Paper text:
Mex67/NXF1 is a modular protein constructed from four domains: an RNA-recognition motif (RRM) domain, a leucine-rich repeat (LRR) domain, a nuclear transport factor 2-like (NTF2L) domain and an ubiquitin-associated (UBA) domain.
Like other NXF family members, ctMex67RRM did not contain a typical RRM consensus sequence that is based on two motifs: RNP1, (K/R)o-G-(F/Y)o-(G/A)i-Fo-Vi-Xo-(F/Y)i, and RNP2, (L/I)i-(Y/F)o-(V/I)i-(G/N)o-(G/N)o-(L/M)i, where the subscript ‘o’ or ‘i’ signifies whether the side chain is surface-exposed or facing the core of the RRM fold. In ctMex67RRM the RNP1 (residues 143–150) and RNP2 (residues 101–106) sequences were G-Do-Yo-Vi-Wo-Li-Ko-Vi and Ii-Ko-Ii-Lo-G-Li, respectively. The large deviations from the RNP1 and RNP2 sequences found in different members of the NXF1/Mex67 family may reflect that they bind RNA in a more general, non-base-specific way, as appeared to be the case in the crystal structure of hsNXF1RRM-LRR–CTE-B, in which the hsNXF1 RRM domain formed mainly phosphate–backbone interactions with the CTE-B RNA. The UBA domain showed the greatest conservation (29% sequence identity over 55 residues), whereas the RRM domain had the lowest (15% identity over 73 residues).
Residue numbers in the entry:
A (entry chain B): 97 to 181
B (entry chain A): 98 to 182
The structure:
Amino acid sequence: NKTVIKILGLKNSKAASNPDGGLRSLLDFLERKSKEKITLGRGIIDGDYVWLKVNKDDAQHLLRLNGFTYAGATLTIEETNEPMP
Amino acid sequence: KTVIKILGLKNSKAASNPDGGLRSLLDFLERKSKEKITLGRGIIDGDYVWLKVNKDDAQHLLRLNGFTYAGATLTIEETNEPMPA
């Protein structure tokens, strides 16, 4: 089944000044870093978080990337049963 | 010494505990291993539980990978990641 992932720290990063807030570049970075071949299509920014809806296997791959540094900011990745905003 | 990462406590019923269910989890791990293991240093960081243990202890903990605790599937893994302060 599907799962919701929250990513924190993009706003604090250097990528934040981008037109889209650095959203796509973040998702692109996550795809490269996992090396499991994760595919991130749609993501959104609500509040300080970046929200992703993914399958169970994908969720584990993202959680592995927790604590990595992106654009000069530490990424915090969390699984949640919260409804997608 | 070895570092162990545990995932799935947040999804469990013990998550609502005062200490996040850390103590109940470690208590469960000690009993389930049947080695009469003593778990010294542990912490909750993000969705993960971190444990610092000797090598033989790690093997018994690793056997419990995939087991269900408090209604949540546990993913137990060894890592060379530094333990967070």
